[PDB]
């Protein structure tokens, strides 16, 4: 049928029970992926094809900048913890290269406040139980499906697409192709 496994999605070896339906592991700094989410807004362009109403998820990774990597992970988790993930996402995403805030916790926090959110919320989340559970959940989530350190969106039990398997002749429509695989895996 001209369509088969290998040049569409990578076949894992074991799924993760109880894991989110659609989860993306990305970094806040290091990958060229910066364009992936900042330019092609794939996580956003792709969410627009939500099939039947499947919920998406976003996770950060621990590599690079030892403490910084982990620190940004908490920050990301803190975002999910406040529920104000979308708003701070980009400002903080764009905050790395375009603002250069890669400093200490109190700094990384400062920009978080600047994202238009009140500190009273971030404070509790800095250590609260919810946040502790979330930071660990990342690593765990990634570890359950051995990442390595790359942007990849896995689907409920299903696997993530192969960016190098698809084509790169339509930077614009590319989202559609990127999005055609995800839709299929969701209910098929």
């Amino acid at each position: 049928a001209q369509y088969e496994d290998g040049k569409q999605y990578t076949t894992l070896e074991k799924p993760v029970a109880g894991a989110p339906q659609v989860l993306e592991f990305f970094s806040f700094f290091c990958p060229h992926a910066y364009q992936f989410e900042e330019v092609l807004h794939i996580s956003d362009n792709v969410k627009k094809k939500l099939p039947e109403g499947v919920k998406m998820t976003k996770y950060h990774v621990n590599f690079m900048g030892g403490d910084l990597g982990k620190d940004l992970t908490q920050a990301w988790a803190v975002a999910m913890a406040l529920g104000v993930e979308d708003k701070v996402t980009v400002p903080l995403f764009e905050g790395v290269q375009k603002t250069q805030t890669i400093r200490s916790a109190s700094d990384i926090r400062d920009v978080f406040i600047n994202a238009g959110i009140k500190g009273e919320e971030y404070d509790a989340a800095w250590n609260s139980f919810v946040v502790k559970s979330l930071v660990a959940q990342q690593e765990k989530a990634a570890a359950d499906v051995q990442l390595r350190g790359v942007p990849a969106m896995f689907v409920n039990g299903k696997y993530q697409l192969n960016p190098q398997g698809m084509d790169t002749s339509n930077m614009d429509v590319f989202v559609q192709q990127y999005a055609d695989t995800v839709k299929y895996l969701s209910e098929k």
Partner: protein, 134 residues
């Protein structure tokens, strides 16, 4: 013909494996790619092909072929991507290697305690594959 590449392999094997020791580990992946390819092909050449300097003499062409193919593409890649940041591209570490094939990185790389220049050597060595044929 064996000693011909062995001289550079002996020194290149070690030199390549030299300037990556106390200098401060500094591990990656793409790094291991050229290293496993660089060592694999240079070895496969002396270790075998580069030996019959008299018969069909053409077992090395296949070995050299792979050297650059990977070399050129391991040199002319991530590097260009670096000034032209692209979505599909990202960061990484170690990198898997099915079909058993012991350690591979868990040792060849970690077994120790600006690479931009490295790009030119492989790109150059590329033509060596053809001339050496005789």
């Amino acid at each position: 013909a064996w000693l011909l590449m062995a001289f550079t392999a002996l020194a290149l094997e070690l030199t390549a494996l030299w300037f990556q020791h106390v200098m401060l580990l500094k591990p990656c992946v793409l790094c291991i790619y050229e290293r496993v390819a660089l060592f694999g092909v240079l070895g496969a050449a002396l270790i075998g092909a580069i030996a019959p300097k008299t018969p069909l003499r053409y077992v090395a062409m296949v070995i050299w072929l792979y050297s650059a193919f990977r070399g050129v593409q391991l040199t002319y890649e991530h590097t260009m991507l670096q000034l032209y940041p692209s979505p599909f591209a990202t960061c990484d570490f170690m990198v898997r290697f099915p079909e058993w094939l012991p350690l591979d990185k868990w040792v060849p790389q970690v077994f120790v305690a600006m690479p931009q220049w490295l790009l030119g050597i492989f790109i150059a060595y590329l033509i060596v594959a053809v001339l050496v044929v005789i």
